[PDB]
Amino acid sequence: LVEEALRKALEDRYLLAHEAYAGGVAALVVVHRKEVDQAKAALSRAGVAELRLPGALGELPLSEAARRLKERAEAAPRELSEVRQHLAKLARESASTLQS
Amino acid sequence: ELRRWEAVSAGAEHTLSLLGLEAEPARPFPEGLEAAEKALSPIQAHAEGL
Amino acid sequence: VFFPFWFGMIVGDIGYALLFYLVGRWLSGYVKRNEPLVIDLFALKLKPQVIGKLVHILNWMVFWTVVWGVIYGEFFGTFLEHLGVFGTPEHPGLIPILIHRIDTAKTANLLILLSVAFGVVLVFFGLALRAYLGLKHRHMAHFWEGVGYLGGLVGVLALAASYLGNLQAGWLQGLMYLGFGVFLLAVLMSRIWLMIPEIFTQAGHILSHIRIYAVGAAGGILAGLLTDVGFALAERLGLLGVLLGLLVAGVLHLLILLLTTLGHMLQPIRLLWVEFFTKFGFYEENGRPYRPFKSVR
Amino acid sequence: GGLDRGLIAVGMGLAVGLAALGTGVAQARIGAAGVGAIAEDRSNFGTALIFLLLPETLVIFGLLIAFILNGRL
Amino acid sequence: GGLDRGLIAVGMGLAVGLAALGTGVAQARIGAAGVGAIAEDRSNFGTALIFLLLPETLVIFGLLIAFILNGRL
Amino acid sequence: GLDRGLIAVGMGLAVGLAALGTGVAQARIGAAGVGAIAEDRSNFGTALIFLLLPETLVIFGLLIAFILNGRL
Amino acid sequence: GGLDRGLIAVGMGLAVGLAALGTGVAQARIGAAGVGAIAEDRSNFGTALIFLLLPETLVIFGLLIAFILNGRL
Amino acid sequence: GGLDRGLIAVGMGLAVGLAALGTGVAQARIGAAGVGAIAEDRSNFGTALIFLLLPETLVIFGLLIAFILNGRL
Amino acid sequence: GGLDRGLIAVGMGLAVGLAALGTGVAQARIGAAGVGAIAEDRSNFGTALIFLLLPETLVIFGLLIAFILNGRL
Amino acid sequence: GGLDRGLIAVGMGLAVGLAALGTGVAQARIGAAGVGAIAEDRSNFGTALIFLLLPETLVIFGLLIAFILNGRL
Amino acid sequence: SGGLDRGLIAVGMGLAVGLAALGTGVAQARIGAAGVGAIAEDRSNFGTALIFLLLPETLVIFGLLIAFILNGRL
Amino acid sequence: GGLDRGLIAVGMGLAVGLAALGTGVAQARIGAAGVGAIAEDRSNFGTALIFLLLPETLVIFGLLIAFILNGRL
Amino acid sequence: GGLDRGLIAVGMGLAVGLAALGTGVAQARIGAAGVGAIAEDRSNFGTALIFLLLPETLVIFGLLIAFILNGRL
Amino acid sequence: GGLDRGLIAVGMGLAVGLAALGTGVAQARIGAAGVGAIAEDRSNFGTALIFLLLPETLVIFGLLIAFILNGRL
Amino acid sequence: GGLDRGLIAVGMGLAVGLAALGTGVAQARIGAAGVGAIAEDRSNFGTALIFLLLPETLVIFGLLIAFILNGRL
Amino acid sequence: DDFAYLNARVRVRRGTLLKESFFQEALDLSFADFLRLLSETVYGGELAGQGLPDVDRAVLRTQAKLVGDLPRLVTGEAREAVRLLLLRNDLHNLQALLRAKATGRPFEEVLLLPGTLREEVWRQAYEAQDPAGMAQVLAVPGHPLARALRAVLRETQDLARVEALLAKRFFEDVAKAAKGLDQPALRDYLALEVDAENLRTAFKLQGSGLAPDAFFLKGGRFVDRVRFARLMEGDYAVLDELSGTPFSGLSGVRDLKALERGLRCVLLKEAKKGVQDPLGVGLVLAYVKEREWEAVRLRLLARRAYFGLPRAQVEEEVVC
């Protein structure tokens, strides 16, 4: 259904396949800059959406975004555990003073 | 001074709320208004940042 | 004075009374734990003072409840089928029943008369409170109205027990005439046009007291039916599934208790708030309460 | 007595059952409006209960006729 | 020979039952509008009670026919 | 002695269904009247007559019942 | 034998009762619309009263049928 | 008349009462809409009156059948 | 005859009465929507009268069954 | 047939009457929505007539049951 | 050849057929009301509307079967 | 030889059934308004449950009349 | 047989009729909601049919009761 | 004996069926409001189920009355 | 024996039929709200199915009482 | 409850309405002829003096007199239905109240037009510490805004994103209540209003480049979320995709002025279908929308006479 718009794009070109991560077929297409913008408009008319993440992951290069996302995924659990621990420690340390 | 004390009570209520604790009545702390504000502000700041 | 009495007249299951005693022991242990009772899906947060007042009210209810249950003679329902603690002339096993209450051929008119007497007494007390308060406030409208409603109710009960009741209407014909004359005289002295609708509403409020005896008989008949079915299906059907049959019957009895006893207790306080308050008014401007300086501590 | 006794009993039962039907029919919309007024404010619960108990006179007269039938029975 | 006192009792019971049914049918909408007015204004509680009690004449006629049947009994 | 009670049964059915119809009319009648009273006190007699209009059915039923009791 | 008069009176009573029931069923919405209209203005009172009172013809026909039964009784 | 004419009059009265019931059931919403139209305007009185009087043939046919039963009686 | 005639008359009366009941039950909403369309426009009165007159086929069928029963009478 | 014939006629009458009752009960909302659609557009008058005639098969089945009863009469 | 059971069987079959038609019409009232509303909404989904309208006829078919069983057991 | 026990049982069954029907008719709108109030907040759930259980006195009186009938049996 | 067969068929007919009445009473609001959802989207026909066929178990149980009656017959 | 036992089961049926009728009557609007409350949030299912299960006490009492009838016959 | 088993079957069928009537009466509003929630969200299908199946306890009790009557039959 | 006793006064008020010639003759006036014609009108019964502000205040008083009573004089399911007819002014008053509480101006700053609840409640809501406490002070039983703001209130203390999400949840709960009623046409009219408001948010946010799924709402039947994204993009073909629905004439338009004008035209045409229901409640909704179209026409003719507008300057205002 999107390959019809890809046939409307660069015909023996627009390298477009969907590899893996079967929760969603990551259809990657590549032709050009401006003709690819027109083809992205035609595919969104056929129904399509770009991987627009928030923050910097949908705002930086994909290798750098993958590195930052992997770093945040490896770091967030110990940080959240320490955050809950220091929060509970501050609560158990100051709740009586706050109550008085 | 009443608005200051009322804002102090509101900040203590929000501090207990962000701490998740509930307002239980107890014997109070006789302290100065700015002194109690100074005691409130550091724990409230650490709690808000956390 | 009365809500525990009508409540004990309502429920006469000594086993359910002991279940309430054990539940009060659990609540008393929660009170001795000095933790506020927190019920999440019930959203019931309770300080220990209200819980202790509830437990004291429960003990005061359970005392007269066990008293009237001994008067009805029913231990966890009709245990006299299995262990004949209650005594009838049909099969005397042990001590006799003051109210047998499985048979209505000798007990129902007495129970209805008891409920009617308690209701008329409470109605008399409420109208007397209304007239005494009208005298205390020196507003003769409310006091004369209570006097006229009381006289109309007395003449109504007299004419009812005369015509629709038994014979020998000579001792009460002048009584009904005097009640009608008191009603007409207070209508002239009041001129409020608080008509026979008001008198009939007061009469229905008086006559509604038999719902106590009704719900007591209903719960007793249900408990006796369930207990007889369980004892039969256990002992007479085999005498081997006594554990299984007794457990299923006790579980169904617990389900029936959880489905019935709340509203059964509720009907007494509903009758109390609907009669003792309403004859005495208790719906005038709601008052202003003591709001002293807090010092929340 | 004969067959007239069960017939009088059936008529008294018809009276009591239809009286309870009319009582619940009056009670339904009245209690709905009272529940709405209670959800408005906690102040008007007394008048709500007064209006709630005002309809039970039909059940009262039905039980009275039932006792009259049982005395005739 | 019987079967006539029971027929009269069945008729009186049906009369009282359908009369209380009509009384409740009126009283439902009556008390609904009255509770709406009372929640709207506590000033007109007496007129609301008057409009509520106005439907009792059907019950009056039904109890009269019941007493007439009982006197025929 | 067979038709002595069936006439009373029919008169009772008449009175009961007449009161049923009278209350069915009186529900909407008194509902609109209480709404008009809640609007203002200025429609008392008109809504009173509108409520009082349904009682002719009860009057005719009482007439038929009195004729039946005169036959009784 | 004498099973004609009671059956005739029973049928006549059923006729009059169901006729009054249908008359009230019409008159409910009739007087409802008329009262809501007269509450708007005191300008169409008689036309509303005519439209309300038009429903008594079935009651008149049922009264004629009941009088015919009484003449047959 | 025995069991024949009594049950005949009973069924005739049943037809008459239920016919008046259906006529009133139609006339309720019919006259309600007509009164709403009259409250909208005092100009369509004739067509609304025609639509109101249209639901009378049920009562007419029921009375005709009742008279046919009376001629059979 | 005898018990046949009164029971046959009762069945014919039941047919006619509940048939007119259902006919008026349709005719209520029929005339309601018709008077609403008439208040909307007078140019649909023919379709309104057609939709009104459509319901009488059940009354015709019940009258046919009643005439067949009277022929059996 | 002096006893079974009247009961068979009573059953056929009950069938025809309740069938017409259900037919009119369907036809009420049917004709209401159809007259609303006709006021919306004359372009769906045929669909309105089809949905109106959709209720008559039950009356046809009841008439066939009555015809089978008359054949058993 | 029952003298009273034959009329009683016709009475029961007639009550069955009549109340079955009553229930079928009670369903078909709201069914056809919503169907005509959607038809005035669109003349596109008339087939599903007619399918839903015909869906209530199974109770009528069962009642006709019961009446045929009563007539066979005459 | 006597079916007055069966007649009394039939009347008691009709009594209990109509009483349960009226209790359910009250409880429908009562629980509807109460579940709406519970959907509003958890504030007045106790008074809502009180008003819900308040309708049980009719079914209680019906059970009392049934038990009186059983004791008469 | 005698009279037990005819009364057995009468009870089976009353059972089947009341069961079909209740099933259609369910199916009314069921099909109303289902046609509303169909008007919402065509992506619900696989659940609307299940919601429609959910009330058929009552008709199945009534037909099983009638079949048990016929087997006892 | 062959009529006294027969009416008893008819009375038990008249009890149980109308009892379940009132049970479903109470259950309808209550379960509708509970489904609306569960559709509002997945947090109010408990009180909804409590109010839904609250109506079955009358059905249990009617089943006890039916057990009393089966003990009587 | 005479008309005993037929009366018992009549009572059992009446119980089952009015039980299915009440079950469908609950299931009407139940499935209406449930289909509205299902069109709102497919994620609420389970609680809707549980609320829909909640009305079947009356049908189970009626089938059990019918089997009890069949054992009495 | 009684949808007919109110319908009688609704038909009486429907008898009190101005014709199209009352505005067609009002195409040529000089505000003194318009003042005389309004003096003939019932809405000029509150006519205080001369001037545009006096005219608008008299129009507001007439709207309160003839339209405000519809929120009263009813009780029950009909009250719960008719409450969700004059709800835009109430949500506007609540939005101005939230804006004033978050901003800091005086409580007498906004002019607080007439709605459904008591204005004393709105004055008392100026002083409240918690937003949930202010919601409980503003809590009526059948007010949909009270249930909406409380459910949306579990995010923060007072935010503007909270206000926009509260408006979204307000429209959503309005659609939920419209589905939760026994009204065959009110649900359809509310859904039409919901889809029109979705199209209005789309046209107002066309070219903004924001997230359309965060902007799109749920409750409609005339459009799609993919159609919503196509309207978010610069594609008028999606507006051309509206065929067969009530959005018929809304085609080939890109300017939001005439777009919402035709949207209001389609909404008023759907409101004209309310005369079919003389027994329910939609006839009263049609009367309310008719008074609303009269109010827009009245303030339009008032601006035209006070500023001397050309007939061509307002010719696109009385086409329907």
From Swiss-Prot, chain P:
Example of a GO MF term: proton-transporting ATP synthase activity, rotational mechanism
Pfam families reported for this sequence: vATP-synt_AC39
Statement: the UniProt record of this protein carries the keyword Ion transport: yes
Keywords of this entry: ATP synthesis, Hydrogen ion transport, Ion transport, Transport
KW Chloroplast (keyword) present: no
SUPFAM superfamilies hit by this protein: V-type ATP synthase subunit C (SSF103486)
Top-level taxon in the UniProt lineage: Bacteria
GO biological process, one term: proton motive force-driven plasma membrane ATP synthesis
Gene3D superfamilies on file: ATP synthase (C/AC39) subunit, domain 3, V-type ATP synthase subunit C domain
Gene Ontology cellular-component annotations: proton-transporting V-type ATPase, V0 domain
PANTHER family recorded: V-TYPE ATP SYNTHASE SUBUNIT C
Family of the protein in this entry: Belongs to the V-ATPase V0D/AC39 subunit family.
Cited function: Produces ATP from ADP in the presence of a proton gradient across the membrane.
Protein name, entry field: V-type ATP synthase subunit C
Organism listed in the record: Thermus thermophilus (strain ATCC 27634 / DSM 579 / HB8)
Lineage: Bacteria, Thermotogati, Deinococcota, Deinococci, Thermales
Gene this protein is translated from: atpC
